[PDB]
Design a protein around this nucleic acid. Structure first.
Ligand SMILES: [Mg+2]
Ligand SMILES: [Mg+2]
Ligand SMILES: [Mg+2]
Ligand SMILES: [Mg+2]
Ligand SMILES: [Mg+2]
Ligand SMILES: [Mg+2]
Ligand SMILES: [Mg+2]
Ligand SMILES: [Mg+2]
Ligand SMILES: [Mg+2]
Ligand SMILES: [Mg+2]
Ligand SMILES: [Mg+2]
Ligand SMILES: [Mg+2]
Ligand SMILES: [Mg+2]
Ligand SMILES: [Mg+2]
Ligand SMILES: [Mg+2]
Ligand SMILES: [Mg+2]
Ligand SMILES: [Mg+2]
Ligand SMILES: [Mg+2]
Ligand SMILES: [Mg+2]
Ligand SMILES: [Mg+2]
Lengths: 117, 64, 144, 201
RNA sequence: UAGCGGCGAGCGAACGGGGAGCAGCCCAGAGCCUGAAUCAGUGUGUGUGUUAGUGGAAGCGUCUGGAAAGGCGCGCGAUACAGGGUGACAGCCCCGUACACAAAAAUGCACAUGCUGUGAGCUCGAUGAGUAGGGCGGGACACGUGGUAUCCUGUCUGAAUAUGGGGGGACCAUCCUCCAAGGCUAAAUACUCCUGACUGACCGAUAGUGAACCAGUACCGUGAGGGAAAGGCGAAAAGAACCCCGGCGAGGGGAGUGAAAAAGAACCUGAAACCGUGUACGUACAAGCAGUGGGAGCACGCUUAGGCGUGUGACUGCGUACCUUUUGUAUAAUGGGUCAGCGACUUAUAUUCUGUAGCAAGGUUAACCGAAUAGGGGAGCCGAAGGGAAACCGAGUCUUAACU
């Protein structure tokens, strides 16, 4: 016969109020933040992690297109050479070879340049 | 206590060998029956299906 | 033998389990999950006994005349039992256990129904072919 | 059959004490839950009426005065007073059918076999009103604070059991399973009283 | 249900049945006998209650702690372990407690009595006139004049008188039942300013009484009237001698009290908003819901590197709060400054489905009784038969003259 809301009352606010970052002004100090902002965070987060898979790919190719072309054949022709193979197909990501194993990479551009029929 | 709607009683109170209390029939009788002969035989009553459910609530203990 | 490793373990009661399913819609209120509202949630009939749309009219059409049989009910005497809890004097008036007329009444008339006699000075004023031909293993009688 | 080894007594007995149903919780659980709501001739829920000290009808001027929209004051929102859908004394007491009442009770004997189903005597030699040396008799089975209740059926001087909560008498027809199951080993006892359909103790 | 009802809304019986309770008597009058039962007011007594009360059991030790009722060891009372209180929770410390006693007096009710009044009992009698009916107007009967019986009547009339008079729902006959105009009568129902005892799946200082506190106070009003805020040091005041700064201030710092003063009187626990001091990092050429994704550096922390944890975040892709209300929904439609507590499908009886349990062509009792959740009680409710508007018939029955 006792709601005595006080009992979870606190725990709930405290829960979301637990936004370490503090963000700014009311965004931590006032409960107002939670479903307004802590909620946005959940939303902005929901999409960015999955939308990110590509944002890096866009970078991966951005550099491959910037590395492979300097030594003949553009990114457009590159993957096409690479495309022809029985086993020769190791995708990008590691494609950053242009930063650590340049010799490999340029030795990989021939795997495509000389590969393009 | 649940009060049966005394009206429907007088109306279709019954309960054949399996509920489905046989309402009743007749139309224009005792107003305009100076029309049609064949299509007007009191026959007997009958119940329904799509509508039975609504007419169900009255009765409880077999009364009359 | 009782083990002194400190706890009994006999079998008395404590309790006796339970009877069926259904012991609370979850009412007594509404508060908690689902945030009930009741007053069925819309905003029409709120406090009960608001049988808006009286059952009468629209259901209340056509109402044949009628009367009443002043016969108390003239119970049939019964399921073709006469004679045997029927005082075995076969006639019939009232002090019976298995099948009884219940007394307040005018006349009887028995149908034939369940299992019949083996002995039976059937009276009861009464009748039926169900009667004359099933109770007939014994004692006709009808009188008036 | 046998009611296990009996201490001090030759043995126990072979009475019907109901067909000997198994249990079917559902049933008893209901009578039980239903039992914790019998002597309820009434129950407080004092604090009520949505018409608290309503010494007045709305005096706050509706349109204007800035934020407003007040009215009456038994107003369920006004900290002042007014408790909403109030409350009430009610009945509580649900009633269990007659047959459902006797259904499945002393399932004790079989299940609680190695515990409860003892039958001896109501202790006849007990002093006029003496509970002190109850222990002497409380040891004929070694069942004491373990709880247990007797069912002798004689409002004699054996109603002597008075303690924080151990032995209860109620030795009489009047007795519900709720109690029989509240104790470790309900000493049926009584003897012969435990007949077939009337195994009532 | 019957019935009443703009036959609207709605109003709503009784006969009859099951129980609680259970008794009938006076005057309308004389005589015989003759103060006789019956009551009433009063003085008295006895029972049994009310008003003060009396007796009422059985525990030590050691541990922790300021404090023992608590832990652990053993021990005793129990017709008493309801409860309260005592320096933390006690059957055995105190009040009580079951049980067992008790009243000069004063009264409640009972019985009994005396006094006063009453008047029993037998015989033979008498038997409630402006009344019953009725015309007009109304009201009461579940009955709204309806065909409306019956009851009371404002107003005006007005009889028979027991081989007579009323009633039996217009009214008449028959039959049945009962005597009106005079009166008395034991055996329940309602409410709470207050009384004592007791209880609570009732609140616990924004609650619960407006009021836990010198509250109907302070206040406010010409007034009637309205009507607050406001609890907690500690076990113990042991409420801080004395010293020092200071205005012989405030305030504080020591010392001492204390288990604690990180209990100092603003005194339990002391959160949030809000306001500061300190430290690590970012930051004075850079535009916007201030984050999110990426991310170097820096401060610490890493590890027998191993590529990490915490803080901060330059630079950079994105990218207009929540609510409400709206077609508008990022919407510039609604709702919400934030937090904490409270805030809305319940409850009763009835009816019907589903699951489950009991029993089975049978199932089940209601009130009530009660050696109260038993057992008893089957009044009654439902089902095993239906058809017809019904009488009526009946595994048939209506329909029709029909047997189809
Ligand atoms: Mg809450
Ligand atoms: Mg990158
Ligand atoms: Mg059938
Ligand atoms: Mg919703
Ligand atoms: Mg709603
Ligand atoms: Mg609605
Ligand atoms: Mg709608
Ligand atoms: Mg309408
Ligand atoms: Mg208002
Ligand atoms: Mg008394
Ligand atoms: Mg305690
Ligand atoms: Mg406050
Ligand atoms: Mg102290
Ligand atoms: Mg710095
Ligand atoms: Mg971490
Ligand atoms: Mg803006
Ligand atoms: Mg709006
Ligand atoms: Mg819309
Ligand atoms: Mg008993
Ligand atoms: Mg009987």
């Amino acid at each position: 016969a006792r709601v005595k809301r006080g009992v979870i009352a606190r725990a709930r606010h405290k829960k979301i109020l637990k936004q370490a970052k503090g963000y700014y002004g009311a965004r931590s100090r006032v409960y107002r933040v939670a479903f307004q902002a802590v909620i946005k965070a959940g939303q902005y987060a929901y999409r960015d992690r999955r939308q990110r898979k590509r944002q890096f790919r866009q970078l991966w190719i951005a550099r491959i297109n910037a590395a492979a072309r300097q030594n003949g054949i553009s990114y457009s022709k590159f993957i096409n050479g690479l495309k022809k193979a029985s086993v020769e197909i190791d995708r990008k990501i590691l494609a950053d070879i242009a930063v650590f194993d340049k010799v490999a990479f340029t030795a990989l551009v021939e795997k495509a340049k000389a590969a393009l029929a | 206590p649940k009060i049966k709607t005394v009206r429907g009683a007088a109306k279709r109170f019954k309960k054949t060998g399996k509920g489905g209390f046989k309402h009743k029939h007749a139309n224009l009788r005792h107003i305009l029956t100076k029309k049609a002969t064949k299509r007007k035989r009191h026959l007997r009553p009958k119940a329904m299906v799509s509508k039975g459910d609504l007419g169900l609530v009255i009765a409880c203990l077999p009364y009359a | 033998m009782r083990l002194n490793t400190l706890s009994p373990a006999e079998g008395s009661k404590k309790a006796g389990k339970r009877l069926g399913r259904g012991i609370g819609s979850g009412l007594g209120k509404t508060g908690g999950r689902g945030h009930k509202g009741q007053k069925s949630r819309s905003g029409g009939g709120v406090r009960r006994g608001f049988e808006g749309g009286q059952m009468p009219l629209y259901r209340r059409l056509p109402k044949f005349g009628f009367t009443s049989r002043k016969a108390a009910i003239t119970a049939e005497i019964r399921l073709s039992d006469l004679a045997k809890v029927e005082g075995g004097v076969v006639d019939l008036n009232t002090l019976k256990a298995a099948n009884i007329i219940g007394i307040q009444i005018e006349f009887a008339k028995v149908i034939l129904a369940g299992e019949v006699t083996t002995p039976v000075t059937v009276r009861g004023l009464r009748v039926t072919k169900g009667a004359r031909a099933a109770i007939e293993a014994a004692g006709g009688k009808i009188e008036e | 059959m046998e009611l296990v080894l009996k201490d001090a007594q030759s043995a126990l007995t072979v009475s019907e004490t109901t067909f000997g149903r198994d249990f079917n919780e559902a049933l008893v659980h209901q009578v039980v839950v239903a039992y914790a709501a019998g002597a309820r001739q009434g129950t407080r829920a004092q604090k009520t009426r949505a018409e608290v000290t309503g010494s007045g009808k709305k005096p706050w001027r509706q349109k204007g005065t800035g934020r407003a929209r007040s009215g009456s004051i038994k107003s369920p929102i006004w900290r002042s007073g007014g408790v909403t859908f109030a409350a009430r004394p009610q009945d509580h007491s649900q009633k269990v059918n007659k047959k459902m009442y006797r259904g499945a009770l002393k399932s004790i004997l079989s299940e609680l076999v190695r515990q409860d189903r003892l039958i001896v005597v109501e202790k006849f030699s007990v002093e006029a009103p003496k509970t002190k040396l109850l222990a002497q008799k409380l040891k004929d089975m070694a069942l004491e604070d373990v709880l247990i209740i007797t069912g002798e059926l004689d409002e004699n001087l054996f109603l002597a059991a008075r303690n924080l909560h151990k032995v209860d008498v109620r030795d009489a027809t009047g007795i519900d399973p709720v109690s029989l199951i509240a104790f470790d080993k309900v000493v049926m006892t009584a003897d012969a009283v435990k007949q077939v359909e009337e195994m009532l103790a």
